[PDB]
Symmetry: C3
């Protein structure tokens, strides 16, 4: 009996009944201890003696044994104990080897990480993916991972090691073909990695989430090719209430916080500092196998960001046999700013970017039905390369309502570069244009419409302070066709502007172009006393349907017309009044109108 | 001693002190084991031998015994262990029998559901409510449930069974008269039920929440009368970050995700697919006992939905002695679409519905102070039955600002049906009207104002692309009174429209009606050389306060007036200019204005 | 052996191996029990006998011993057991004595509070801070607190005791110089305290959060000087999904729910009832040591509130050597109302308040780049003291877009009081002005511009119903300079108003002032048959650039001009038409325009 009690079966001979309740099960101590499980239950030598974790101990085989066994019982939760640092020091074997995997995750087996998990220097200058849910080196032949949750107050520490080569990949958690999986509460820190977490595989997966996690200093070298902290590659999945911070210069050029790459995905309530980019919202044709060729129901809401490049990047692209499409997107409630930096020292600053594909093509995209509403954007006055939207690829629709944009440009694309075909671009009058860049805009157009064509578009410009440095409020080059569109410039703060709207190809004359903007016009009257016509000197107003005075009349003896219409020769004409006769000659500020 | 150790009191004789700390309590093993409790502690036969759960074992009495005992100690948390499926196979007894209850919940007794709970076929074709917090068959005589939380990674599975009769009710969790209760993390799946979760009873309760839950395939038959996944029937309560999915055809006609039925309630950050409806926002007079007759502070925000009927349904109604009122509502940040379906194949598609009461009455409602802002809505081009608002019952106010609506109608009600009395309907110019249904609108009015009367309303129509198929942008039948209102149609994309605004009863002439819209007008001048009047042929403009040209003047020898006013006979008149004399006759596009 | 087994080392001699797995560690029962720890492990007398908690037992020394020991092992989580009330009855010692501290928190030592913690009457009429993370009486010489989380379903109860003197301070949790600390799930209730929770110290700290907590009845006496439930005094920190309720009259005058006092902080998704105020958003120069002199990236979103004073209060101030600045703020998606109360019975009601510093100074502030969008506000019709913004101190910018404000005033400041210098105030036309206070506004200006000066501002007034009781829609006193601004009053619902816009100093004549508003004007014509001038009687229109008719013409024999311009003497002039000659005399409603 003494022998049995001191044996490993001893707890199995000591009886227990809950709180001495005579209606409760007559159990043994071992039964109650078996209700939980920790790493300590597997972290032992071949004789069963516990092994203490530390920098000179590789915990990997023990944690895999724990996961393997619990999986064999239908699942449960393994605790990684608090107050210890558990090091990993070798690669895993089998199906995760193809993924440079360390630990293989299994279905229904959760990890409650309370302590620290820390990579040993075996991993310096090597690729690695710490937790992998694929069960095959080829993801197309992998089984699924289901019902796998990682959570707790603990930490995954990537050891600070730099990438050995740019072509290497590194990851924290790759759930794989993942269904009902999640990461909650965990701090990922101190590395040079490609991603911290990836959800799904090429549309396969569902109901995967990252919640209340922290991501700190996960890019550190010039070798790192590219970084996105969370890649969402399955539908009905998202990121909420997370914290992302980088301190490295390289992060300001390469790093993005989130990628939303399948339908019904979201990014909410998070804070970002030190990153190049906020979120990619993309349908890659090459990723369309699991959930279709459309990314729709995409939501970026209520985030706080300090970035160096672009906040939201929209895109879609094609392969030889698949075409990707992006539609039904909402971007709302975000507060974003470009951090302090020299002009042109990072990727062009933007709130929205319509980005060309990975080969630079601008003619592959199918992006439409996007709503950008209720956001703030700010860039410091020196940052020339800052825009509400950089529209660099073909666009089939994007709607802006009730935003506050305070940056160098409202709409921009570089001349000479891409020539996007633009449809259904809507810039409502409720967008407020800030004044930070007033006086900085010599030679520049606030809306610089450097496109192949614009159709079914609305641009309602409203200033809220003067900026007499800008060349124009909106400019269309002669190469940009314009049709079935509405372009207006409100008069407030424009009285002293040389140019307000500029149509280099006289595109405002098109049959279905609706415009209005201020202009200075010289007029001369006939000499008749009484009601008397006034006519413009210049003859470039054949497109004008009506015009009206924006100027006071300093004269007593006459008044020019309050309103005007045109004539076939392109003059403006209206009826004023000569109290006394005489030829009159005046220069008036007019609101020019066409079909509005 | 050997006997005592092997007895159920054995753990009570084995000493323990935490980590060998000499300052810690000298306890016994049983004391430490007593700090937790699981189903295994009650899942035993009359001799105390543990019983293994399975399809042929009814776990119900054991789980009730666990809850009853823990309740007797002031509460705690019972674990339902992972790696096992616990079946329920009989009805509960006592106060929950009136509710077809299975398990009775008790105050301060939480359930950590890590495994699976699964209904046995005893329940096929029968009513049931799995967890019930009432303690009496009559809810009015029930005590309260307080401080009861259900949480974990586990599952409640309803066994797939169909309803036996439409009059039956089925539920997952009915908290009852519930205060500080919640469901977090749980998957509810595989059933034909009326609700998954209900919070509160007729306004009694507070601080009840459903967070991070999943609801999958909970309608499956033509017998199911009606389904709402979560019914919120107490104040200061809500639903956040949940996932709702249905696959059944019947769900597209009957199922709603949430009901917000008391004040200070919310529905946020959730994803919905396959449902008829998103949320009811309602004050039923019949439910007003616990928290008053007003539903106020109602919040529907930041959700993602694919539905087949209506996204938000507003209503209030009366009983013989109580009148319900709905006010102070916000609907914001939602991205919603009607899924692919034939026209008229499901309940009329809508973003907002003002719905008649359960007996079809449209004259009982008191709905006001509602803000609908910053939302997107889309319906495919074939879905005739799609509207930004179906306004089908009396409305005392609703405000639309900065939404993007892309569907067949903006405002609709069916003619010949209800004749709502409308007050304080505000449709701000910042609402963007999409183009998906361009060319589909033969015979139809984009704003079809099929009401008894409209007062204190604003409709500012702005198109963003052409749709020459529509009969009009806005139409008032002669039966609809219109007063103290503002109705405008912006000219952009309207030059080729036959009709823009239509007032079948000439209602735009009312003393306090403020309007503007485009119209084509034929004019003829006098023959005088010089300043010369032009007059409309037609005499239906006695209501016009001013008009101005929307057309160019192709003539050299004359120009028509830029602006016009009227005369008592209903002609328009203005002063143009004949360079050379002659009677002139022109057809001009004008902006007609009344008091604006 | 019997002796060893019954000794406190007995569990250390009973062997265990997990689930009889021969690959698992050969452990002892004590090893597995040592994986968790509770208060019971320290709640014992000097002989090691457990002590039962209760009203006559002071648990403080035992809980401190638990925290101290766990800290010595690198941390972990202590459970405060369910089903017991643990009383605290004495002050702590050492570094927390300076803070009237009870329990000292330590790094990596979490508290899972499942039971109740309750203050004994030793604390009646005394100061106290229940949990303190400082380790020194002087916060400047304190070390940090890191990785400390308090969570669970339990309760902190402040015993109901009133403050003994107004100068006393009371707190629930002061994390101190706190990094990665949080409170989740806890109910704080039944007290008279200054704060429930404070995060950070004068900018020192990071990543501190309060989530899913309840705060109930935490002010109860006239002695309580001031209350803010959560004070956020470190960056990258915030409050989400919490519930705040007060019932005391004194709370309606003194209590605020949240203070956001450092950069990158947030307040989201919460419900508030019974409070004076919703949130302070402030940069105090005196708090700028840890994170700089700027509060930026401040977010108040998606909250529900019933308050008695002001929802959001903006401010910044200076010390002898530091100047505080507030910028980049977003207030969005909130639904707020002033509760039922007499006019002037609580602090002036407001959605936004621009508040003077604690000494009443209005000339110290630097507040700019604020966006207020997509909110609802309501105040009952009797509450004279209700405003969308009380602008009481110097303002460098604030933007309003697409809100719904339903209260007495839109913009207000009291005359004779402060004279703020105002820049970059933007009130977009998409703001909807409700009608609740129609007929209540005798003697009052809806926008009462009681400022020293206004520059670079926009006010676009749009009514949605009539209120002929108001003196004016917008009024500038002669003492208020106005320049480089845009002020418009839409005509809808204004035909019967005596005054629309009022410029007591004729400020609308300034060179860069852009205005438009309705006015009644008397005109007289010359007697000439045919085209004939009409001139205003009055000569106060030298500022007018154009005007147009808002009235119909009831005459057959003539028509007045549709449009007008001015003359140097300040008359208006335009060209009408006399079919028959005669001097005409008419009174017309005109839209007066200046540079628009
Ligand atoms: C870091 C990042 O995510 N960057 C975005 C771009 O992603 C693209 O480049 C990445 C570079 O790291 C990835 O490619 C790399 O990894 C591939 C996947 O690894 C293989 O498969 C894994 C399952 C195994 O575990 C690995 O062992 C390995 O076998 C690899 O095939 C590539 O060769 C390599 O360079 C990224 O790849 C995706 O990764 C996710 C996450 O792991 C995975 O779920 C997907 O299966 C995988 N996709 C593909 C197609 O392989 C790859 O997509 C991203 O393209 C870009 C988007 O913006 C651009 O394109 C837009 C749309 O046209 C346009 O609007 C915009 O302007 C463009 O800039 O954004 C980041 O740069
Ligand atoms: C499924 C659903 O919720 N549908 C909404 C309508 O709800 C109404 O019908 C339901 C049909 O299932 C419920 O009625 C049924 O259940 C009743 C309650 O069961 C009793 O009481 C429970 C406490 C016991 O546990 C049970 O054992 C039983 O005794 C029953 O009395 C009815 O006879 C039965 O048909 C639903 O009832 C409510 O249920 C909640 C949740 O359990 C409960 O808290 C309430 O006490 C109970 N209320 C009442 C009054 O009994 C009942 O409300 C809903 O009416 C509709 C709203 O839209 C319509 O009305 C709007 C306002 O006028 C109008 O704008 C809109 O256009 C209309 O369509 O929405 C769903 O259909
Ligand atoms: C209750 C509250 O928070 N009210 C807001 C005002 O806060 C200011 O008054 C408070 C009154 O309770 C605090 O001052 C009191 O407490 C001080 C701190 O206690 C000391 O330090 C602690 C660390 C120790 O633990 C204590 O033992 C003690 O030694 C004390 O020095 C003061 O003497 C005392 O009256 C509040 O103080 C802050 O408290 C936080 C939280 O604990 C702490 O982190 C900070 O270090 C501490 N700050 C300072 C400067 O001491 C003090 O700030 C608040 O000022 C007001 C803001 O609105 C006004 O000002 C705006 C900007 O100009 C203006 O826009 C607006 O119109 C104004 O009304 O809001 C609440 O009233
Ligand atoms: Na690979
Ligand atoms: Na859109
Ligand atoms: Na072109
Ligand atoms: Na019943
Ligand atoms: Na409203
Ligand atoms: Na009628
Ligand atoms: Na102190
Ligand atoms: Na702003
Ligand atoms: Na002044």
């Amino acid at each position: 009996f003494r022998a049995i009690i001191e044996s490993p079966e001893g707890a199995g001979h000591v009886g227990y009944q809950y709180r001495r309740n005579t209606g409760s099960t007559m159990r043994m101590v071992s039964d109650v201890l078996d209700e939980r499980v920790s790493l300590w239950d597997f972290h032992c030598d071949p004789s069963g003696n516990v092994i203490q974790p530390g920098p000179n101990v590789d915990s990997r085989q023990y944690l895999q044994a724990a996961i393997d066994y619990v999986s064999s019982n239908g699942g449960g939760t393994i605790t990684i104990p608090a107050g210890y640092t558990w090091y990993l020091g070798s690669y895993g074997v089998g199906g995760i080897a193809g993924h440079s995997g360390i630990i293989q995750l299994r279905s229904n087996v959760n990890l409650n990480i309370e302590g620290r998990i820390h990579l040993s220097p075996f991993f310096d200058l090597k690729p690695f993916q710490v937790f992998v849910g694929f069960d095959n080196g080829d993801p197309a032949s992998s089984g699924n991972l289901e019902n796998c949750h990682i959570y707790g107050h603990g930490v995954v520490d990537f050891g600070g090691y730099e990438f050995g080569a740019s072509s290497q990949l590194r990851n924290g958690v790759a759930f794989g073909r993942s269904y009902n999986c999640s990461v909650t509460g965990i701090t990922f820190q101190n590395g040079d990695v490609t991603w911290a977490i990836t959800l799904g595989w090429n549309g396969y997966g569902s109901n995967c989430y990252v919640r209340k996690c922290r991501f700190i200093n996960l890019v550190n070298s010039s070798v790192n090719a590219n970084h996105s902290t969370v890649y969402v590659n399955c539908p009905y999945s998202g990121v909420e209430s997370c914290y992302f911070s980088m301190s490295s210069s390289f992060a300001r050029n390469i790093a993005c916080s989130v990628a939303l790459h399948q339908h019904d995905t979201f990014y909410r309530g998070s804070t970002v500092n030190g990153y190049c980019r906020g979120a990619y919202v993309v349908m890659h044709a090459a990723e369309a196998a699991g959930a279709g060729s459309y990314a729709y129901n995409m939501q970026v809401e209520n985030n706080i960001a300090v970035i160096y490049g672009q906040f939201v990047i929209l895109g879609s692209d094609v392969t030889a046999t698949v075409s990707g499409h992006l539609n039904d997107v909402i971007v709302s409630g975000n507060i974003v700013s470009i951090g302090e930096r020299a002009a042109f020292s990072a990727p062009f600053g933007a709130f929205i970017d319509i980005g060309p594909d990975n080969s630079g093509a601008s003619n592959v995209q199918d992006i439409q039905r996007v709503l950008v509403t209720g956001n703030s954007f700010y860039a410091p006055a020196n940052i020339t390369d800052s825009a509400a939207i950089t529209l660099r690829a073909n666009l089939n629709g994007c709607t802006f309502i009730a935003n506050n944009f305070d940056c160098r440009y409202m709409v921009y694309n570089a001349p000479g570069t891409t020539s996007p075909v633009v449809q259904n671009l809507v810039w409502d009058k409720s967008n407020v244009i800030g004044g930070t860049h007033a006086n900085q805009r010599a030679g520049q157009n606030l809306f610089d419409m450097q496109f192949a064509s614009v159709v079914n578009s609305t641009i309602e410009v409203q200033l809220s302070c003067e900026d007499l440095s800008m060349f124009s409020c909106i400019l269309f080059p002669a190469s940009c066709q314009l049709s079935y569109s509405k372009i207006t410039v409100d008069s407030a703060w424009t009285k002293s502007m040389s140019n307000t709207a500029v149509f280099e190809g006289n595109q405002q004359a098109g049959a279905n172009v609706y415009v209005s903007y201020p202009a200075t016009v010289n007029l001369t009257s006939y000499n008749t006393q009484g009601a008397v016509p006034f006519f413009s000197t210049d003859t470039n107003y054949a497109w004008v349907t009506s015009a009206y005075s924006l100027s006071i009349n300093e004269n007593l003896d006459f008044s020019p017309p309050a309103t005007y219409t045109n004539k076939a020769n392109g003059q403006l004409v209206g009826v004023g009044y000569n109290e006394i006769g005489g030829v009159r000659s005046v220069s008036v500020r007019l609101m020019l109108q066409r079909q509005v």
